[PDB]
Design a protein around this ligand. Structure first.
Ligand SMILES: [Mg+2]
Ligand SMILES: [Mg+2]
Ligand SMILES: [Mg+2]
Ligand SMILES: [Mg+2]
Lengths: 142, 142, 136, 136
């Protein structure tokens, strides 16, 4: 299937994830996995009152940029987790961080500490930053 | 739970329902149950190329306004179906129509011919026409 | 150049029109012009608590009467406004948008748009994948 | 009176800015000003295919260098723009919106808003139940 994630829905899932991260005081900062985790990370930062937001950039492996530390007291966030991605690398670099994602495919579940929505292994997900509102012809030309 | 239905999502569900109603040629018109079925009915009419759109109005029972006929060749649409509503009355008035809804609670499933999304019996659903985009304070005042 | 109307924006306009139509009690029902007026009509129905909503499809089908006590609504008015005007001579005719040529044909409208305006309504659109500007 | 910015509108503005920043190849990375510049930054990152995104939190945390080859982005610019200007003297400083007092502080921006403009960003909002205008 093709799972469409709209801006409003991503915000709903993010607020639900933020609620599970309370109390906010247990966190010192947030490390967003670029580029997928940037928007979810910004939403979490807004909800938790956290201003210390950093990034970790990894082309597949090549660490372009890395937030310092072991992730203790930090939340590391990405948009989706599955097998064959960068989840293992993230856990090795920040073994002390709380790793969360918005979405998770079956194979990615054991790689994160928490997530919001379950996605079937076979489902393609379209994120809002990759879409736009445009004219769509009607299904029937009647 | 509180199930939030955004405008974009309602449109996605509606297009998916329209796809199941193809070929369009098997339909002569659409009868929307007011007020819940008005928007879904307008979306279906746009997708199927149907311009003959009528309404059926029923305060709970009192038929304020009724589209004539027995529903043969017509699609009757409402937003949600459950027990204790007007589903039985609709089937009696237009026994020959194709009754569809976007959402269905377990108890309402056997009352309609087709629907798109399953909603738990205990879940409250907020439709987009009842909402708006407004300032929301952060979960944490940190 | 395209004048895009999103669901959120349409809803904001319909609510401005609703507040102008208060008190709701003065109305018997709403007649939506098919298909453009269906969504604006449903929005007014919700805001004004009006359960009696009918339609006019032009004449494939038409609501009874002369529109007395009724609000007739369409989405846009350029130059049907006349057919409605003569079919429901006693109705309060309103639209969300109005182009210069349609302004005198309605009793009220919310948004003024230029005559050459290329407007796209939200029911004709949708959220789809859009290739990035750079292929990098 | 409130100037509301929806996700859809912000995205349209970010894409206009992206097309102005082509070719993407001329850039090494993007430095987003926390937290306002995080979302506009992620949008530019996607449109320009830039994977190197860093942040400056003001100084709780700051990206290395003098901004050479980098795009520094914030959401709005009134009167930090100066701190950035001196921290990354060689960076291309851009914002989505700009109030009159902030205009000369940035190298480029997309939308001009009046100095008394009360702007609300989409990350501070959400879809919630809104009582109908009539209780009928
Ligand atoms: Mg990702
Ligand atoms: Mg209903
Ligand atoms: Mg029209
Ligand atoms: Mg800001």
């Amino acid at each position: 299937e093709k799972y469409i994630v709209t801006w409003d829905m991503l915000q709903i899932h993010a607020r639900k994830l933020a609620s599970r991260l309370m109390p906010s005081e247990q966190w010192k900062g947030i490390i967003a996995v670029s580029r997928g985790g940037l928007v979810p990370g910004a939403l979490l930062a807004r909800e938790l009152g956290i201003r210390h937001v950093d990034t970790v950039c990894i082309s597949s492996l090549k660490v372009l940029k890395r937030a310092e530390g072991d992730g203790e007291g930090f939340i590391v966030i990405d948009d989706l987790v599955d097998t064959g991605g960068t989840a293992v690398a993230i856990r090795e670099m920040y073994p002390k961080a709380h790793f969360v994602t918005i979405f998770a495919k079956p194979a990615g579940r054991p790689l994160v500490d928490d997530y919001v929505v379950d996605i079937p292994q076979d489902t393609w997900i379209e994120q809002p930053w990759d879409m736009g509102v445009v004219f769509v012809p009607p299904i029937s030309g009647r």
